[PDB]
Amino acid sequence: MKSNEHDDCQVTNPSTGHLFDLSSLSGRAGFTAAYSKSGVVYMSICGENENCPPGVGACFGQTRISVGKANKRLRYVDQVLQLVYKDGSPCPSKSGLSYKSVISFVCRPEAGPTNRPMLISLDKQTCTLFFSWHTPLACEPE
């Protein structure tokens, strides 16, 4: 089949033929993560979150600012399942800039307290949010 990459949140590992399906993590309610003391981020995997304006994949729930439109561009980059969202709302930090959420899925076969969107850091100038997620669903057994 043409390309192990697919704009359907599913990627096959060319090394062992492990099919990563992230649609198993998809959802309309999504997952809620705590950011600022009085704020939570809405995030839906490969789908749009209904707690924020239609089309929104990532959004902070205070005023409902979009930090990524619900796209599904999953890329497999060296054990890393990247789910990149773009076309959010204009970032107030720099008028005309846009937010972006980078979902980074990492193999954690032992599971743990890392099976939750872990905000790595926010690149202050580029309005880019990095998210870690350690799960055994995203692993290929070596």
Binding site: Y35, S36, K37, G39, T63, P92
Partner: protein
């Protein structure tokens, strides 16, 4: 997508403050204080003019209170 305000007076203003200043404290509107720090800022500025993140970030609450 088109919105009537590129600077949402209120919404984007207070949310950006609360966003990164949630822990530090956010107060750009100061009526008084015995420190004579009663100077409001960014409210009318970032309502009608375009602002940079620097302004709001270095404002936040008080500029030298993390020191």
């Amino acid at each position: 997508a088109y919105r009537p305000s590129e600077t949402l007076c209120g919404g984007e203003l207070v949310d950006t403050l609360q966003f990164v200043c949630g822990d530090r404290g956010f107060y750009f509107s100061r009526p008084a204080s015995r420190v004579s720090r009663r100077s409001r800022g960014i409210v009318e500025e970032c309502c009608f003019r375009s602002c940079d993140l620097a302004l709001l970030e270095t404002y936040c609450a008080t500029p030298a209170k993390s020191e």
